[PDB]
Amino acid sequence: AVKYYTLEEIQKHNNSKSTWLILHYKVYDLTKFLEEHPGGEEELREQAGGDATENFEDVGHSTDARELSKTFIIGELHPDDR
Numbered sequence: 548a549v550k551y552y553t554l555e556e557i558q559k560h561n562n563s564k565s566t567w568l569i570l571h572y573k574v575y576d577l578t579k580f581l582e583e584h585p586g587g588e589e590e591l592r593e594q595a596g597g598d599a600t601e602n603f604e605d606v607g608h609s610t611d612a613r614e615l616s617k618t619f620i621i622g623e624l625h626p627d628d629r
């Protein structure tokens with residue numbers, strides 16, 4: 548099965564206890580990854596609650612970074628909001 552989240556609910560996760568963001572229509576919970584991210588935590592916090600696909604691709608993440616990102620997926624963006 549697959550869990551779908553709306554933009555409305557995703558935007559609520561942008562505080563000190565929860566950081567979610569969207570990449571290629573998939574929703575990632577990066578709350579616990581903030582301090583481990585090689586690119587710093589500020590880059591992630593600034594995009595929290597929204598779509599960071601362009602920023603993610605603009606920096607050009609490696610294959611290893613992309614494989615690791617998969618472990619943080621919690622669902623997808625509801626089709627109605629795409």
Ligand code: HEM
Nearest residue numbers: 575585586590591594599602603606607608609612615616
């Ligand atoms: C899905 C979660 C993400 C993962 C797993 C991740 C992982 C990593 C890793 C492993 C690196 C080291 C270099 C590489 O392997 O490419 C990196 C660098 C970086 N990341 Fe991320 N990243 C994620 C999301 C993002 C997002 C959303 C942004 C920006 C909005 C961002 C901005 C950067 C920057 C600025 C660097 C530094 C690149 C440089 O040294 O020029 N990352 N990230």
